[PDB]
Amino acid sequence: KPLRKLAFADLLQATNGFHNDSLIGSGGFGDVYKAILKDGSAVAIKKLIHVSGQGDREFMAEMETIGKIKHRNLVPLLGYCKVGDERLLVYEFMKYGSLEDVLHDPKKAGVKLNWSTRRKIAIGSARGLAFLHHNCSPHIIHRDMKSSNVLLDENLEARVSDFGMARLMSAMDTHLSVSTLAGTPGYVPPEYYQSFRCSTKGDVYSYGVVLLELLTGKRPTNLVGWVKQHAKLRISDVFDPELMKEDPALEELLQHLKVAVACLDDRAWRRPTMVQVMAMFKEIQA
Numbered sequence: 001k002p003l004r005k006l007a008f009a010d011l012l013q014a015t016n017g018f019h020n021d022s023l024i025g026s027g028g029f030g031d032v033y034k035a036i037l038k039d040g041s042a043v044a045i046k047k048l049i050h051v052s053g054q055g056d057r058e059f060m061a062e063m064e065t066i067g068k069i070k071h072r073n074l075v076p077l078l079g080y081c082k083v084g085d086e087r088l089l090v091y092e093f094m095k096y097g098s099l100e101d102v103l104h105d106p107k108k109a110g111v112k113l114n115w116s117t118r119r120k121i122a123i124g125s126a127r128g129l130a131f132l133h134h135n136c137s138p139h140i141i142h143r144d145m146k147s148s149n150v151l152l153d154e155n156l157e158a159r160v161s162d163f164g165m166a167r168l169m170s171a172m173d174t175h176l177s178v179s180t181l182a183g184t185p186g187y188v189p190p191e192y193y194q195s196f197r198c199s200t201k202g203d204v205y206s207y208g209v210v211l212l213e214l215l216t217g218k219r220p221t222n223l224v225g226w227v228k229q230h231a232k233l234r235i236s237d238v239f240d241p242e243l244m245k246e247d248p249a250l251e252e253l254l255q256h257l258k259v260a261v262a263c264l265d266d267r268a269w270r271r272p273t274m275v276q277v278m279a280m281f282k283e284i285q286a
């Protein structure tokens, strides 16, 4: 399944002339439309914002990373469209949307995630980042891991998305020097404020915040310090009440909470690698 160059007229009519009825998201990153291609493919179409230089870097950032690799836990980039000042990217449609929308449900309605589901989402998210960190040469730093960049497919499996800020780092390097402090408040590693440098350890910190969301159910914007300050008190009160209402037996949660704590370490050298995170999830299964 190669990457398709899609004609602009196809995307024009598939979105009903970029009509608002199919628009499922705009602003911040780009306009996103739910569409059915003329072959019947159910897709998401990202109409890139600010193509003049800023969006063309994000365009190639995805083309260079998610457009060159395929993995069961990464959002599939199916196509692209380059026409003058118009950049478009086309993904396989994820049925249930982003993890953030499900945790903070619209008007408290939709799909509910039990712990058996959230654990599978945490494992799947971890496997996608480990693939970027370990299996990819050059390595890929997502630089913007968060709950809204975890997409849930038809089977509620996690697929990491939004590689618009991703950067390629050589395996011979420990860090990559950038020019802008990318990332979302609530997920930025504390050492990112110190230098214009990102790393895989930075993605691990941001993952730990996501694993906290699957455990606590709260918004990061904070959440990291609140769990650490309550970790010295009653750790039985930091988890999601719905997870405790299911069965007080899996309070397994602290074993995963140790993983989230280890990821959220202020020292990038003490954080585990995502390969270690996966092996820690494998030891809890046994």
Ligand SMILES: Nc1ncnc2c1ncn2[C@@H]1O[C@H](COP(=O)(O)OP(=O)(O)O)[C@@H](O)[C@H]1O
Pocket: 024, 025, 026, 027, 028, 029, 030, 032, 044, 075, 091, 092, 093, 094, 095, 097, 098, 101, 148, 149, 151, 161, 162
């Ligand atoms: N491949 C996809 N499949 C299904 N829904 C998607 C896809 N990509 C984006 N969306 C939805 O469109 C909305 C806009 O996403 P986007 O602005 O790209 O979010 P982010 O900037 O956090 O990646 C999101 O709420 C997301 O749920």
